[PDB]
Nucleic acid binder design. Structure first.
Lengths: 87, 87
DNA sequence: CAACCGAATTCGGTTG
DNA sequence: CAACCGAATTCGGTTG
């Protein structure tokens, strides 16, 4: 469909920073776009973590990425989709 | 569906900041979650703008929001969806 | 891996 | 409205 398959990363803001750096330096091919480290800005916040979005070409590149990549355990992730539209 | 109906805002980073502040101060009811001001971090960047995501309860609150809200013209937006999942 | 570097951005809020 | 406040966060990159 018009859903870009993506992975969201929550966790300490500095970790994600470097995780991003790690990803750009060694894994450019395994994903597509990587976001700066953001977070939810209102007091209506569901959590408190920092976040990095990472986008993918195919549900398959995503899945491939996941097998190769050793995500630090202080970092949790979720899978989802957003409109490609918005990249 | 588990698509959270959302609006993305591109534009100068400082504008969005205040726009966010404006939204929280006067419009808390018209939307749901508002993001900090992020941007796409790799050199593989589709653009250059800063971004704020804003999420919604219903496709209807979204649409309602849009009629009431006078978005500064230096600020462009897109409509989309992301997994609710991910908020 | 993340704590740390010093430099650069962004923060929330205020004001013209 | 966005430029400006000074303070606090985040940047990319370097290290142990």
């Amino acid at each position: 469909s018009s859903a870009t398959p993506i992975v969201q990363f929550q966790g300490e803001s500095n970790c994600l920073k470097c995780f991003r750096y790690r990803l750009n330096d060694k894994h450019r091919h395994l994903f597509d776009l990587i976001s700066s480290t953001w977070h939810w800005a209102s007091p209506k916040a569901p959590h408190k973590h920092a976040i990095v979005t990472v986008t993918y070409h195919s549900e398959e590149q995503r899945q491939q990425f996941l097998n190769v990549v050793k995500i630090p355990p202080t970092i949790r992730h979720k899978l989802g989709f957003m409109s490609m539209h918005l990249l």
